Design a protein around this ligand. Structure first.
Ligand SMILES: Nc1ncnc2c1ncn2[C@@H]1O[C@H](COP(=O)(O)OP(=O)(O)O)[C@@H](O)[C@H]1O
Ligand SMILES: Nc1ncnc2c1ncn2[C@@H]1O[C@H](COP(=O)(O)OP(=O)(O)O)[C@@H](O)[C@H]1O
Ligand SMILES: OC[C@H]1O[C@H](O)[C@H](O)[C@@H]1O
Ligand SMILES: OC[C@H]1O[C@H](O)[C@H](O)[C@@H]1O
Lengths: 306, 306
């Protein structure tokens, strides 16, 4: 397989399980409480490393205690943490997360040291990005750095995979550099203006994105799987039917495992099925980063799928 | 003034300011992030101590770092922290809080060591409660302990003040022991079944509570002040018109300062105005516990109010 570079956030997730999300001005008594490592960057780097990728992660942590402990944890997930920088005088990004009784979540993040991953730190990784087969990024890192890295990858024929989360509009300059884009329905709408509630709307939104220069458009549809579209031709690839207990990190798992399968030269439909299997396991498990499956578990799940 | 005992929670508040609260399955990027001491118990103990009460606080913290630092902080707010116990092997209660652009908040709590404040630890404070002039409690401590303390106070002619927050139904056995109850509109509805949207509904809900044995019923009405009712006769006491920037801890400030004025023998209407002044300052300031005003500030605010 070729080599993967993930560039993105690292957060300290503070997660409280409760029955129902609190409404304005209300206090709700929750149950289980956990502090764990997270961040869309780190979650996708862990999904790639645990599923078998050859992956290195460009990220910034603070030098608070959790910042000084997270690189050691990530190295054990088969991630080359050489390009994870520790920013002195700053604290690691934070997420405050509520998970309801049905397994849905709401997340509020604070950038912290993730905001120090700058164009200059990207430029210091130019050779690493140029030599990689693929670059996977999200939108929890400064837009300027995402753009700087997409440009380096574009110049060197490094595949640019962008999971455009959390949702925001992006400049056409950045969208023209992306090879693979993986919005959920909300993100697809934010990027194109087309609400996606069915496969017909998914093809409409996909076409706008293809019109921006993006060849492979994968619009994730929750329990309905994904609308896969390559330069206009699209199809729905259903996910696996499982009993969801906590949907957090589903998307992150899908992305990291998706790129691992593509870098092993599995064709797109098969890579999507591999990623659907990894994400299906993840939604049957509690927590975000801890819920990401290992390669042997993903294969065992696929092997049982007849 | 007589002596006050506050019995209630201590939490580590993690507060993220954002523009709008996240909806289900969404991630929202916030701005300012702070960790500060909080808890309805500690916030009311601080509001009482800073406004001039002679107050002691019965509470339980964990022996995590924040637990071992919070008693020292609370002692500086003129609070006798002798009855704050440190529970080995447990972590301090936690709150995860989002504050929106308009200054509204949503809170999710995890009990942690607050759940160790038991009937046996209450019973160990029997003389302290019996000797106090008033006992102020909230519903972030085990119901059984609230009940044990209300009983001791009741037996010794110690005024029982209960701020029934967060909202839940309470047994008639407990309501019969309360002398002063201070629900907000949501809590009044939860306790009586009567939605409170005006002064007519407030009198209806107040009457149910008087019918439960509670002589003084104060139903807080947000920016509309409070419906004050003593054994049936009620009136609205408006609050002060201010520019709210963060409404968190408004209720807590109102309660602690309310009891301070009552223990200085100010009649009820004047005590409510003093408390309205303290809470009005608090809503013009960011954060929960840090927003609670000191006696000199409250008086200066009242002195300017002509
Ligand atoms: N309820 C579910 N059951 C099984 N797989 C699911 C379920 N929900 C999501 N998935 C998996 O996670 C992927 C992403 O889900 P989606 O909700 O659209 O993304 P996100 O979590 O990024 O918002 C899906 O394409 C699928 O692989
Ligand atoms: N917008 C406001 N402006 C001024 N005072 C306010 C405002 N909102 C609340 N208060 C003060 O806080 C007290 C409690 O407010 P309320 O919203 O009813 O309680 P809680 O925060 O416990 O839900 C009020 O009675 C008043 O003293
Ligand atoms: O996608 C899940 C992640 O979103 C936010 O980044 C949290 O850190 C969490 O780990
Ligand atoms: O009333 C504000 C308080 O409610 C919750 O207890 C939080 O800890 C916060 O300090």
């Amino acid at each position: 397989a070729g080599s993967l570079v993930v560039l993105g956030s690292i957060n300290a997730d503070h997660i409280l399980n409760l029955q129902s999300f609190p409404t304005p001005g209300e206090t709700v008594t929750g149950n289980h409480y956990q502090v764990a490592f997270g961040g869309k960057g780190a979650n996708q780097a862990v999904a790639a490393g645990r599923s078998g990728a050859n992956i290195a992660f460009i990220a910034c942590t603070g030098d608070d205690s959790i910042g000084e402990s997270v690189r050691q944890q990530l190295a054990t997930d088969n991630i080359d943490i050489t390009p994870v920088s520790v920013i002195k005088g700053e604290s690691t990004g934070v997420a405050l997360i509520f998970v309801n009784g049905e397994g849905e979540n709401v997340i509020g993040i604070h950038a912290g040291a993730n905001a120090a991953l700058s164009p200059a730190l990207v430029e210091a990784q130019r050779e690493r990005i140029a030599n990689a087969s693929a670059l996977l990024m999200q939108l929890e890192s400064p837009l300027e750095s995402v753009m700087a890295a997409a440009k380096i990858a574009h110049q060197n024929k490094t595949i640019v995979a962008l999971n455009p989360a959390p949702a925001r509009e992006l400049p056409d300059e950045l969208l023209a550099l992306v090879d693979i884009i993986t919005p959920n329905e909300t993100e697809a709408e934010k990027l194109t203006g087309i609400r996606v509630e069915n496969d017909e709307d998914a093809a409409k939104a996909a076409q706008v994105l293809h019109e921006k220069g993006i060849r492979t458009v994968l619009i994730t549809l929750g329990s309905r799987g994904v609308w896969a579209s390559v330069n206009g031709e699209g199809q729905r690839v259903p996910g696996f039917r499982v009993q969801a207990v906590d949907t957090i990190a589903a998307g992150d798992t899908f992305n990291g495992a998706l790129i691992t399968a593509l870098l092993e030269e599995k064709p797109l439909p098969e890579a999507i099925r591999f990623a659907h299997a990894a994400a299906a396991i993840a939604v049957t498990r509690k927590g975000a980063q801890p819920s990401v499956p290992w390669r042997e578990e993903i294969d065992a799940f696929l092997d049982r799928q007849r």
